[PDB]
RNA sequence: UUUAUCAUAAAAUAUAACUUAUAGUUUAUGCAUUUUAACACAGAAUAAAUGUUAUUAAUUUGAUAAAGUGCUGAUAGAUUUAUAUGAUUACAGUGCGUUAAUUUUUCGGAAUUAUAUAAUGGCAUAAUUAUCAUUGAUUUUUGUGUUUAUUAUAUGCACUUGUAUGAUUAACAAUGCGAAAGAUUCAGGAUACCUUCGGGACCCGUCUUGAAACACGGACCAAGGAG
RNA sequence: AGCUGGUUCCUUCCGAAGUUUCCCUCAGGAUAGCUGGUGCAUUUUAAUAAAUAAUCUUAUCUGGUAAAGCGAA
RNA sequence: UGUUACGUGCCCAAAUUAACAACUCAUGCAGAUACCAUGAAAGGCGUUGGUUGCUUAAAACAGCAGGACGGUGAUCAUGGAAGUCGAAAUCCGCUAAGGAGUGUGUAACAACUCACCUGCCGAAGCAACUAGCCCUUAAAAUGGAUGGCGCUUAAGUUGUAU
RNA sequence: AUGUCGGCUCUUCCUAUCAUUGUGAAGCAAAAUUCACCAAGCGUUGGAUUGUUCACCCAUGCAAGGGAACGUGAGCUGGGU
RNA sequence: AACGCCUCUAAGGUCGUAUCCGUGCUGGACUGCAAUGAUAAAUAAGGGGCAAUUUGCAUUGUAUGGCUUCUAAACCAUUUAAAGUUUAUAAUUUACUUUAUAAACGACAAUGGAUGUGAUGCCAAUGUAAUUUGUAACAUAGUAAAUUGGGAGGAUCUUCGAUCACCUGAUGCCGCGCUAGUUACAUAUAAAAGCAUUAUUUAAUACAAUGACAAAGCCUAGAAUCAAUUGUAAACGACUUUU
C-alpha cells in the first residue's frame, strides 16, 4: 500500500455520467462492489446510491462520519470547507475551464493568435548564450556583440 | 428484462347461482402488466387448477418498492430448471431494489448456471436483517469499518479526441 | 504530411494489440488518413507465446502443392505479420483496396525521418487498457524469429542505435525547454503583452 | 424530478439571450453557487468553418445494394448525433482538379479545370456523428477519401 | 468471490535492510546481495515503517490471492538466504559401479563418469552463482549450494535428471544422482 | 424511501476521556512524542447511526395517462390543360354606418364588461331506470329553481395579392438568353463507345423435383425452316 | 413412334397439376379435381334484408386416439 | 423520401454502446445464432456458483510429535496367520483411548500403518451431491476454413438496456 | 458413354506409430519383448505360386505397421473378369 | 499457494523430440530493391547532363477570397493492473539509473489536441488583403544582413551518402530588415449594383512540382543488340566466350 485510490467513506468523487455530471460528491456508504451511497449537498446533488462505474473517485479524503443522513452530511461538508478546497484544486479549475474552452465567442480566439505572434518573436530573440553546447563567440563584431549586449545593459553601442 | 414488480389477483369465473371462487394473489417480477398476468397464471396453476380463460383475471396492479435508497440484504429462494436436473438455491443479493435484486439475479443465474429466464422461478422474497446472512461475499458489506480499495479505472475511449496524444497513461499517480 | 487532418501519422506499435490496431488503421485508410505503424515488433497479441506459436505454425501447413509457390507467403517479418492483419481487413481484391494499402507504410524498429517523429497513441489499440490483469500475451517480434524470421537479432541493434540518437536529442529538448520557458516568464510581467493575453486567455493552458 | 427537469431546462433558454425568464442558475463557471448543471460534452475533430473537413468515404448502401442518390458524410468535429444536428441543413461543395476546361461565361468565367458539385447536408447517419447529404450532382465515388467540402451557409441562428 | 483484502507480513531481521523501488526488492544482509523481481505478479509493497514489510492483495479472485503467498515466502527466502544461506546435498546411490563426480571450483559444469559403467560423459551445466563442493567425511556426498533457492535446486535436479537409467529397470537400478535433503547452510545457534 | 421535526430502543457508522503496540525520531533492551486503511461500542456523552411508532416538506419519488398549451429544425414530394365537354364556391380579414364604460399603448387602435335566443357544465331540489351496496356513490332519461362561466345563433353589404376549393409552389428576385440568316451562353443525358468508382451479373435451349453444372445439342454467321 | 430433340414477334391480365378412377394400364390416355375463357340470371349479395355464401362463436350430435387401466372383460 | 425483419470491430450497410452483470484462457475443428454441416457415454481438489451432512472452543479441521496393548498364537481356515490370503465372527479388561482389527507384508513370527484418545495447532475445514464453461474423452486422410481477418475485462458464451 | 481388376510405373498425405528419435508403463533384474505418448521427418523390402488385391510360403534386415485421392488403360499390359 | 500444512502448477520459473523453424541446401521477387561504372552519337554538329535550375511563356497541384493553413522538433526505457508519470533536498549514475527523507498528475473530473510543447499558425501586415498599406514620434523589452578557411560527425524501402550538419577561427562592411507597445500623418483596395450576393461560383498573390517554343546563362564525350565467333552452351531463342 503506497495508496491507489479507496472507495471510502469520505473519499469523494467527481460523477462523470450524471444529471449530476461534474458535481463533487462524498461517499456515505459502501454498498456493493458495484455501487456506493453518494450525496453531494453543497453541490446540490440529492441523495442517491450511483454505480462506481458513473463515478471515478478523488484524491481528496475527509473523516467523514460515514453513515450519515443528509443534513449531518451537510454539516460535516461546511466543517470541512470541502467546496474551498475544491476551488483550489486546479485540476478542477481546469475542469472549469474546459466549460470555458466551449465557444469563447470567436472574438475572444483570436485575441490569443494575434497577440502570441507578440511573445513568438520574443523569444528566438531573447536566445543563444549559456554555456550549455558551446557557448562561443568572439565574433566578428560591431553589429553582433553589440546585438548580445542589446539584451543585457542596453548602453551605448552599435556600431 | 426490466423488473417491475406486480400485485396480480384471479379468482375463476363468476356465476350467480355459484358464490365467490375464493381470490388467490401473486407477486410477479415482469417489465409487463401482462408478463405479470402470464407468469401468475402459471405459479396459480401449480397448486389450484385456474386456467384462464376458464380463469378471471381480477386487477393486475404495480407494487411500490417501499425503500428504494434502503441499503438492504435480501435473500431470494430460487427454483431453476437444467436440462437434466431441477434444482433449489439460496442466494443473497445486496441491492436496493427488490427489483434490481430480481435483475441481477436473472443475470447471475443466467451466466453461471445457463440459467434460461423461462427456466427460472422465483420462490421467495424476504428481507434479511441482521446475521441471519450465511453470504460470505455478502456479510463482507457488513463489517465495520468499511473503507476498501478502487482496485484499477476504465478508460473512457479515447477521449473527447479520436487521437489521444497525451497517452493513457495507466499510472493514476 | 499534407491531409484531411494529417498524411502521416506515425503510429507506435508498442502495447498495441495486433487485431484491434489493425481495424483502427483498416478504417483510417479508406477515410485517407495514410498512417504508417513503425515498432512492429514491440507490438504484441494476446494469448500466451506458446499458443500464438502454434497458432501462427498452422499457417505455414497450408501450402499449394501443385506449386507451392501460387501458394501462401508465410510473412515471418512483424511489420509484414501486421500488414497480413490489416489487409484481410481491407478489399484487397478491388482496387480501391490497393489504394489503401499504398497509403500503409509499416516498419519494424522505427526508422527514417520518423525517429524525430511523434509516435502516437491509438488507445483502443492499446493492451494495456482493453486487455484484463494477469492475463498472459505474446509479442509478435517473438513469435516472427521462432516461424523464421532472421532480422529479429539485426532490428535489435538498429533500435539500440536508433536509441541512442534518440538519446541525446531528447537530452539536449529538454534542457533547451528549460531555456525557452524562462525565456518567456522573465519578460512577461517586466511590461503586460504577456499578462494580456495569458490572463485574458486565463483558462488552463 | 420530472419538474426538476423541466425547472433545470427553462434556465439554459433563459441564458441565450432571453425571451427574459427563469434564471435557476446553470454554471457558466465561477459560480457563486454553481458547478451545478454540468460541464459540457464534449466530442470533436475540427475544420470548420469555409468547409468541415469532412470525408466521402462512402455511399448509403444496403449490405451489397449500393443506393448512391444519398452519400454518408463523416463530419470531422461532428462525434455525436447532436453535433451532426448543427450540420443538418448546411450547403455542401466537392472542388476537385480536372485536365480539361468545358465552362464559359454565366458566372465568374471557371477556367473549368477546378470543378465543383454542390450539395446539401440531410439528416444524422450515424450513432457516431457521421451524417446522409443529398448532391445535386452526387460525387463519382472516385471521391473516397477524399476531402469534401461544407460550407456552414445555410446556417439557422 | 473476489476478497477484497489479503494481507501477508514478512519479518526481517535487524542485520537486514530490503529497499523496494517497484517490484524489486534489493535485499543487503551479511553474505551479501540478492535482487529478485517479483514483476510478472503485480503485488503491493508496504513498509509499516518497520523491518517488516507487509505485502497485500486487493480486489484479486482465488488465483490472485494465491501468488500474493509466494511472494511472502519468496521474499522470506531471500531474506533467510543473505543471513542463513541454501544447501541442498544429493546422494549419488551405485550398486557396484561409482558415480565419479569431478570438477568444482566453480566454473563447475559437473562431470559424471563411469555412470554405470557406460563410457558416456555427461555435463550438466552449471547454473550461475551456485557452488558445489564435495563433502568431506561423507562418501560421495555432491552439495549444490547458493543464496537463490530456485538456482541450487534446479541445478541439483539437472544433474538428477540425467542419470536417467535408460531401458533397465529404475526400481532395481536405484542408480542415480537423487536429491536427499533441502536444507540451510549455517543458521541458527552454534 | 427522502427533507424538516418528536418520543422510545439506542448510540451496533462516526465523533470521544483513556488504554496499548510497531516505527521515523527522541530519550536511555526498554520508554517518551507523533504518525500508522496496526489498536480496544473504551468510560460518561454527542450527532436518533440504524430500527419502530407519530407528524411533514414548493409533499416526495416512481410510473402511467392527458392539453394545438406554446414552438423550432431538417428531409423528399407539390399532376395544378381550374372550362378537351365543365365549375371556381365557402370562410376569413379589412372598411361602412348602434352607443357606453374601464384599462393598456398612450398615436393609430386593441381587449373586457353592460342583451335576447338555444345548447352545455358546474350548485340545490324532485321523479324514473339500471348498477356498486345503501354510510355514500355511479348510470341512462326527464323536469324544476338559483347563480356563474363557456360556446354557438340573432354579425348584412362593399372591397380584398386574405384561407381552403378536396394532387393549392408561388409571392418576391436574381442570372443565362431567344441576340435575323448567323449563332454565344446555360441546363440536361450509361446513345454507340471510351474513362473513373461501387454494387450486381455463373450458359442458353431442354427433359427434369431441382441446371452454372464434372447433364445433353449448340465453333461462328447468313438464308430456308415446324400447330 | 405413347419416344427424343426442336418449333418461328411482343405486351397486358389471370393462372395450374403431378391427384381420383379405369385401361397388357405403370414413359400414355380417357375421366373426375384443380385452370382459363365465353358469358347468363339477380343484385337490398345493383347501378343515380325479414335473400345468402362461408369462417368464428353459440347451441345440439358423433368418435376409441393421446392419456389412463390390468386389485375392469 | 420515410420506417422495418436479420444484424451492428472491420470485411459488409451498421454503436469497437456516449449501457450492464456474470462465465470462459482453450498444444493441433476454445468458441462463435434455429434448420446447420456433428459430438457422447463416462471423468476432473481446473474454475465458478448451488445443496445437504459434519468436527468444535470441554482448543477443533489439515499437518507434525506420541500410544495403537493386554484377558490371549482368545480363535477356524494349517498350506501358513498372535490383528491383518480368507471367515463363524467380536465380548471384557486396563483404561485417556486402542478393532479377537483399515491396510504394508515375512510363508510365518516380527517391524510399518490406520481407527480411538492425546502435546502442538486454540478457528477453521472436511465428505457426498447439482451443473455451467473449460479441459479429458474427442484419432484420418490434397492446404482450409465461426464465410474471412482477427478476437482472450471478446468481436465468445448466458442474460439485460438503448 | 465418367475408360473394370490386378500387376508394372509414379504421386502426396494421413495416423489409429511396427521400426528409428526423445519419452512415460511393466508381475522389464540382464537380455528381450509388450503397453502408452509427442511424432508420418525417415523406413516398411527380394522372391516361389496365384490374374489376384487379399492370401500362402521362402530368405535377410533391429523392424519387413495400417489407411486415403473403387489413383493411375490419348501410360502399359489386356492376364482374370 | 489453493488445502496454516503439502505438493511439477494455480501465478512465476528450468531442461527437454528423428518434431517445428532457421542456419544450411535449392528456384530467385521476371521490372522487389541496393551498390557501382561508362554515360553517348563527335563537330560542317550539336547532343545529353546539373536542371534541383534561371527568363518570356505554358501545364499541373496547394491554398482556393492573403491563408477561410500546417507541422519528417515532439510527453521515456519497461516489467505492468497497487502495475505507475515527476520534482526537489542528501547520496548515486553512462542510463527520468540507484538509495533514504518530504511531496506530487492518488488508471477522478482532469486530461487528449496543442504547452503548437526549438511556445505554429491566420503572423509580417500600426487599415490583416481575389491591392499592398506607405510615411512621423516616444519610451521599454530588444532584433541583426553577407562571405571564406580548418577540425571532428552523421545515413535501417529513402524525395540528390563525389550529400547535408555542428563547432572553432579569420575577413571585412550593404546598415538590407527592424518587431511588439502607445501615439501622429495620408491614402488606393474596399462602395464585387446588390437590396435576392452565393451559384455556372472565381482568382491577383503565395508555396511546390513539371514543361519547353526560338534564345540566354554551367558540364561531358557510352554502349547494347544483330552479323561474324567459342563450347564450358543449346531443339530454336538464350547462356558462356570473341575480334
Same mark, same amino acid.
Request: glycine share 6%; hydrophobic share 35%; with cysteine.
Given at each position: 500500500?503506497?495508496?491507489?485510490?479507496?472507495?471510502?467513506?469520505?473519499?469523494?468523487?467527481?460523477?462523470?455520467?450524471?444529471?449530476?455530471?461534474?458535481?463533487?460528491?462524498?461517499?456515505?456508504?459502501?454498498?456493493?462492489?458495484?455501487?456506493?451511497?453518494?450525496?453531494?449537498?453543497?453541490?446540490?446533488?440529492?441523495?442517491?446510491?450511483?454505480?462506481?462505474?458513473?463515478?471515478?473517485?478523488?484524491?481528496?479524503?475527509?473523516?467523514?462520519?460515514?453513515?450519515?443522513?443528509?443534513?449531518?452530511?451537510?454539516?460535516?461538508?461546511?466543517?470541512?470547507?470541502?467546496?474551498?478546497?475544491?476551488?483550489?484544486?486546479?485540476?478542477?479549475?481546469?475542469?472549469?475551464?474546459?466549460?470555458?474552452?466551449?465557444?469563447?465567442?470567436?472574438?475572444?480566439?483570436?485575441?490569443?493568435?494575434?497577440?502570441?505572434?507578440?511573445?513568438?518573436?520574443?523569444?528566438?530573440?531573447?536566445?543563444?548564450?549559456?554555456?550549455?553546447?558551446?557557448?562561443?563567440?568572439?565574433?566578428?563584431?560591431?553589429?553582433?556583440?553589440?546585438?548580445?549586449?542589446?539584451?543585457?545593459?542596453?548602453?551605448?553601442?552599435?556600431? | 428484462?426490466?423488473?417491475?414488480?406486480?400485485?396480480?389477483?384471479?379468482?375463476?369465473?363468476?356465476?350467480?347461482?355459484?358464490?365467490?371462487?375464493?381470490?388467490?394473489?401473486?407477486?410477479?417480477?415482469?417489465?409487463?402488466?401482462?408478463?405479470?398476468?402470464?407468469?401468475?397464471?402459471?405459479?396459480?396453476?401449480?397448486?389450484?387448477?385456474?386456467?384462464?380463460?376458464?380463469?378471471?383475471?381480477?386487477?393486475?396492479?404495480?407494487?411500490?418498492?417501499?425503500?428504494?435508497?434502503?441499503?438492504?440484504?435480501?435473500?431470494?429462494?430460487?427454483?431453476?430448471?437444467?436440462?437434466?436436473?431441477?434444482?433449489?438455491?439460496?442466494?443473497?443479493?445486496?441491492?436496493?431494489?427488490?427489483?434490481?435484486?430480481?435483475?441481477?439475479?436473472?443475470?447471475?443465474?443466467?451466466?453461471?448456471?445457463?440459467?434460461?429466464?423461462?427456466?427460472?422461478?422465483?420462490?421467495?422474497?424476504?428481507?434479511?436483517?441482521?446475521?441471519?446472512?450465511?453470504?460470505?461475499?455478502?456479510?463482507?458489506?457488513?463489517?465495520?469499518?468499511?473503507?476498501?480499495?478502487?482496485?484499477?479505472?476504465?478508460?473512457?475511449?479515447?477521449?473527447?479526441?479520436?487521437?489521444?496524444?497525451?497517452?493513457?497513461?495507466?499510472?493514476?499517480? | 504530411?499534407?491531409?484531411?487532418?494529417?498524411?502521416?501519422?506515425?503510429?507506435?506499435?508498442?502495447?498495441?494489440?495486433?487485431?484491434?490496431?489493425?481495424?483502427?488503421?483498416?478504417?483510417?485508410?479508406?477515410?485517407?488518413?495514410?498512417?504508417?505503424?513503425?515498432?512492429?515488433?514491440?507490438?504484441?497479441?494476446?494469448?500466451?507465446?506458446?499458443?500464438?506459436?502454434?497458432?501462427?505454425?498452422?499457417?505455414?501447413?497450408?501450402?499449394?502443392?501443385?506449386?507451392?509457390?501460387?501458394?501462401?507467403?508465410?510473412?515471418?517479418?512483424?511489420?509484414?505479420?501486421?500488414?497480413?492483419?490489416?489487409?484481410?481487413?481491407?478489399?484487397?481484391?478491388?482496387?480501391?483496396?490497393?489504394?489503401?494499402?499504398?497509403?500503409?507504410?509499416?516498419?519494424?524498429?522505427?526508422?527514417?525521418?520518423?525517429?524525430?517523429?511523434?509516435?502516437?497513441?491509438?488507445?483502443?489499440?492499446?493492451?494495456?487498457?482493453?486487455?484484463?490483469?494477469?492475463?498472459?500475451?505474446?509479442?509478435?517480434?517473438?513469435?516472427?524469429?521462432?516461424?523464421?524470421?532472421?532480422?529479429?537479432?539485426?532490428?535489435?541493434?538498429?533500435?539500440?542505435?536508433?536509441?541512442?540518437?534518440?538519446?541525446?536529442?531528447?537530452?539536449?529538448?529538454?534542457?533547451?525547454?528549460?531555456?525557452?520557458?524562462?525565456?518567456?516568464?522573465?519578460?512577461?510581467?517586466?511590461?503586460?503583452?504577456?499578462?494580456?493575453?495569458?490572463?485574458?486567455?486565463?483558462?488552463?493552458? | 424530478?420530472?419538474?426538476?427537469?423541466?425547472?433545470?431546462?427553462?434556465?439554459?433558454?433563459?441564458?441565450?439571450?432571453?425571451?427574459?425568464?427563469?434564471?435557476?442558475?446553470?454554471?457558466?463557471?465561477?459560480?457563486?453557487?454553481?458547478?451545478?448543471?454540468?460541464?459540457?460534452?464534449?466530442?470533436?475533430?475540427?475544420?470548420?468553418?469555409?468547409?468541415?473537413?469532412?470525408?466521402?468515404?462512402?455511399?448509403?448502401?444496403?449490405?451489397?445494394?449500393?443506393?448512391?442518390?444519398?452519400?454518408?458524410?463523416?463530419?470531422?468535429?461532428?462525434?455525436?448525433?447532436?453535433?451532426?444536428?448543427?450540420?443538418?441543413?448546411?450547403?455542401?461543395?466537392?472542388?476537385?482538379?480536372?485536365?480539361?476546361?468545358?465552362?464559359?461565361?454565366?458566372?465568374?468565367?471557371?477556367?473549368?479545370?477546378?470543378?465543383?458539385?454542390?450539395?446539401?447536408?440531410?439528416?444524422?447517419?450515424?450513432?457516431?456523428?457521421?451524417?446522409?447529404?443529398?448532391?445535386?450532382?452526387?460525387?463519382?465515388?472516385?471521391?473516397?477519401?477524399?476531402?469534401?467540402?461544407?460550407?456552414?451557409?445555410?446556417?439557422?441562428? | 468471490?473476489?476478497?477484497?483484502?489479503?494481507?501477508?507480513?514478512?519479518?526481517?531481521?535487524?542485520?537486514?535492510?530490503?529497499?523496494?523501488?517497484?517490484?524489486?526488492?534489493?535485499?543487503?544482509?551479511?553474505?551479501?546481495?540478492?535482487?529478485?523481481?517479483?514483476?510478472?505478479?503485480?503485488?503491493?509493497?508496504?513498509?509499516?515503517?518497520?523491518?517488516?514489510?507487509?505485502?497485500?492483495?486487493?480486489?484479486?479472485?482465488?488465483?490472485?490471492?494465491?501468488?500474493?503467498?509466494?511472494?511472502?515466502?519468496?521474499?522470506?527466502?531471500?531474506?533467510?538466504?543473505?543471513?542463513?544461506?541454501?544447501?541442498?546435498?544429493?546422494?549419488?546411490?551405485?550398486?557396484?559401479?561409482?558415480?565419479?563426480?569431478?570438477?568444482?571450483?566453480?566454473?563447475?559444469?559437473?562431470?559424471?563418469?563411469?555412470?554405470?559403467?557406460?563410457?558416456?560423459?555427461?555435463?550438466?551445466?552449471?547454473?550461475?552463482?551456485?557452488?558445489?563442493?564435495? #563433502? /568431506?567425511?561423507? !562418501?560421495?556426498?555432491? +552439495?549444490?549450494?547458493?543464496? =537463490?533457492?530456485?538456482? *541450487? &535446486?534446479?541445478?541439483?535436479?539437472?544433474?538428477?535428471? #540425467? /542419470?536417467?537409467? !535408460?531401458?533397465?529397470? +529404475?526400481?532395481?537400478?536405484? =542408480?542415480?544422482?537423487? *536429491? &536427499?535433503?533441502?536444507?540451510?547452510?549455517?543458521?541458527?545457534?552454534?
Amino acid at each position: 500500500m503506497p495508496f491507489e485510490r479507496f472507495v471510502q467513506t469520505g473519499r469523494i468523487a467527481k460523477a462523470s455520467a450524471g444529471p449530476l455530471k461534474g458535481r463533487l460528491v462524498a461517499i456515505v456508504d459502501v454498498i456493493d462492489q458495484n455501487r456506493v451511497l453518494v450525496d453531494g449537498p453543497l453541490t446540490g446533488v440529492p441523495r442517491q446510491e450511483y454505480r462506481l462505474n458513473n463515478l471515478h473517485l478523488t484524491k481528496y479524503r475527509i473523516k467523514f462520519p460515514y453513515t450519515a443522513p443528509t443534513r449531518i452530511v451537510r454539516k460535516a461538508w461546511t466543517e470541512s470547507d470541502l467546496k474551498a478546497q475544491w476551488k483550489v484544486s486546479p485540476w478542477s479549475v481546469k475542469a472549469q475551464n474546459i466549460c470555458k474552452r466551449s465557444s469563447l465567442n470567436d472574438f475572444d480566439r483570436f485575441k490569443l493568435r494575434y497577440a502570441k505572434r507578440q511573445r513568438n518573436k520574443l523569444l528566438t530573440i531573447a536566445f543563444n548564450t549559456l554555456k550549455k553546447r558551446t557557448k562561443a563567440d568572439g565574433t566578428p563584431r560591431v553589429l553582433k556583440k553589440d546585438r548580445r549586449e542589446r539584451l543585457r545593459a542596453e548602453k551605448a553601442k552599435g556600431g | 428484462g426490466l423488473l417491475k414488480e406486480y400485485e396480480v389477483v384471479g379468482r375463476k369465473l363468476p356465476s350467480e347461482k355459484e358464490p365467490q371462487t375464493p381470490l388467490y394473489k401473486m407477486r410477479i417480477f415482469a417489465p409487463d402488466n401482462i408478463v405479470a398476468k402470464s407468469r401468475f397464471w402459471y405459479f396459480l396453476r401449480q397448486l389450484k387448477k385456474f386456467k384462464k380463460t376458464t380463469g378471471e383475471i381480477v386487477s393486475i396492479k404495480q407494487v411500490y418498492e417501499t425503500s428504494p435508497v434502503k441499503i438492504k440484504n435480501f435473500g431470494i429462494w430460487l427454483r431453476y430448471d437444467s436440462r437434466s436436473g431441477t434444482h433449489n438455491m439460496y442466494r443473497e443479493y445486496r441491492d436496493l431494489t427488490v427489483g434490481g435484486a430480481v435483475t441481477q439475479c436473472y443475470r447471475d443465474m443466467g451466466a453461471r448456471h445457463r440459467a434460461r429466464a423461462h427456466s427460472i422461478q422465483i420462490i421467495k422474497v424476504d428481507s434479511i436483517p441482521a446475521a441471519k446472512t450465511r453470504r460470505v461475499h455478502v456479510k463482507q458489506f457488513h463489517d465495520s469499518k468499511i473503507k476498501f480499495p478502487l482496485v484499477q479505472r476504465v478508460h473512457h475511449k479515447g477521449n473527447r479526441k479520436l487521437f489521444s496524444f497525451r497517452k493513457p497513461r495507466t499510472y493514476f499517480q | 504530411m499534407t491531409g484531411l487532418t494529417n498524411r502521416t501519422v506515425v503510429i507506435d506499435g508498442r502495447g498495441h494489440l495486433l487485431g484491434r490496431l489493425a481495424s483502427v488503421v483498416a478504417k483510417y485508410l479508406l477515410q485517407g488518413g495514410k498512417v504508417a505503424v513503425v515498432r512492429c515488433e514491440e507490438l504484441n497479441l494476446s494469448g500466451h507465446f506458446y499458443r500464438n506459436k502454434i497458432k501462427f505454425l498452422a499457417y505455414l501447413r497450408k501450402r499449394c502443392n501443385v506449386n507451392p509457390a501460387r501458394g501462401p507467403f508465410h510473412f515471418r517479418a512483424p511489420s509484414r505479420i501486421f500488414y497480413k492483419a490489416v489487409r484481410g481487413m481491407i478489399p484487397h481484391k478491388t482496387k480501391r483496396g490497393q489504394a489503401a494499402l499504398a497509403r500503409l507504410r509499416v516498419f519494424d524498429g522505427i526508422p527514417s525521418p520518423y525517429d524525430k517523429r511523434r509516435r502516437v497513441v491509438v488507445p483502443i489499440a492499446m493492451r494495456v487498457l482493453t486487455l484484463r490483469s494477469d492475463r498472459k500475451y505474446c509479442q509478435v517480434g517473438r513469435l516472427s524469429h521462432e516461424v523464421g524470421w532472421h532480422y529479429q537479432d539485426v532490428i535489435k541493434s538498429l533500435e539500440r542505435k536508433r536509441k541512442a540518437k534518440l538519446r541525446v536529442t531528447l537530452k539536449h529538448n529538454r534542457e533547451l525547454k528549460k531555456l525557452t520557458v524562462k525565456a518567456r516568464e522573465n519578460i512577461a510581467k517586466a511590461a503586460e503583452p504577456f499578462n494580456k493575453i495569458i490572463k485574458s486567455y486565463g483558462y488552463e493552458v | 424530478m420530472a419538474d426538476t427537469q423541466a425547472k433545470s431546462t427553462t434556465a439554459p433558454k433563459a441564458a441565450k439571450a432571453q425571451k427574459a425568464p427563469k434564471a435557476v442558475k446553470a454554471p457558466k463557471a465561477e459560480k457563486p453557487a454553481a458547478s451545478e448543471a454540468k460541464v459540457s460534452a464534449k466530442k470533436y475533430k475540427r475544420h470548420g468553418r469555409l468547409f468541415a473537413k469532412a470525408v466521402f468515404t462512402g455511399y448509403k448502401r444496403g449490405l451489397r445494394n449500393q443506393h448512391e442518390n444519398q452519400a454518408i458524410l463523416k463530419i470531422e468535429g461532428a462525434r455525436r448525433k447532436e453535433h451532426g444536428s448543427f450540420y443538418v441543413g448546411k450547403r455542401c461543395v466537392y472542388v476537385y482538379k480536372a485536365e480539361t476546361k468545358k465552362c464559359v461565361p454565366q458566372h465568374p468565367e471557371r477556367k473549368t479545370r477546378v470543378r465543383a458539385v454542390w450539395g446539401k447536408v440531410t439528416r444524422i447517419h450515424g450513432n457516431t456523428g457521421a451524417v446522409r447529404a443529398r448532391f445535386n450532382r452526387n460525387l463519382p465515388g472516385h471521391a473516397m477519401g477524399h476531402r469534401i467540402r461544407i460550407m456552414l451557409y445555410p446556417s439557422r441562428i | 468471490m473476489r476478497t477484497i483484502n489479503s494481507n501477508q507480513c514478512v519479518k526481517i531481521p535487524k542485520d537486514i535492510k530490503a529497499s523496494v523501488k517497484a517490484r524489486v526488492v534489493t535485499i543487503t544482509g551479511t553474505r551479501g546481495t540478492l535482487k529478485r523481481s517479483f514483476k510478472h505478479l503485480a503485488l503491493d509493497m508496504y513498509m509499516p515503517d518497520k523491518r517488516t514489510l507487509k505485502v497485500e492483495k486487493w480486489f484479486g479472485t482465488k488465483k490472485e490471492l494465491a501468488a500474493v503467498r509466494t511472494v511472502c515466502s519468496h521474499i522470506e527466502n531471500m531474506i533467510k538466504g543473505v543471513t542463513f544461506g541454501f544447501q541442498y546435498k544429493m546422494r549419488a546411490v551405485y550398486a557396484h559401479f561409482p558415480i565419479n563426480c569431478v570438477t568444482s571450483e566453480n566454473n563447475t559444469v559437473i562431470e559424471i563418469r563411469n555412470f554405470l559403467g557406460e563410457k558416456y560423459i555427461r555435463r550438466v551445466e552449471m547454473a550461475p552463482g551456485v557452488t558445489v563442493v564435495n #563433502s /568431506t567425511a561423507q !562418501k560421495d556426498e555432491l +552439495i549444490v549450494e547458493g543464496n =537463490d533457492i530456485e538456482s *541450487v &535446486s534446479g541445478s541439483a535436479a539437472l544433474i538428477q535428471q #540425467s /542419470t536417467t537409467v !535408460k531401458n533397465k529397470d +529404475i526400481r532395481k537400478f536405484l =542408480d542415480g544422482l537423487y *536429491v &536427499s535433503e533441502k536444507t540451510t547452510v549455517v543458521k541458527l545457534e552454534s
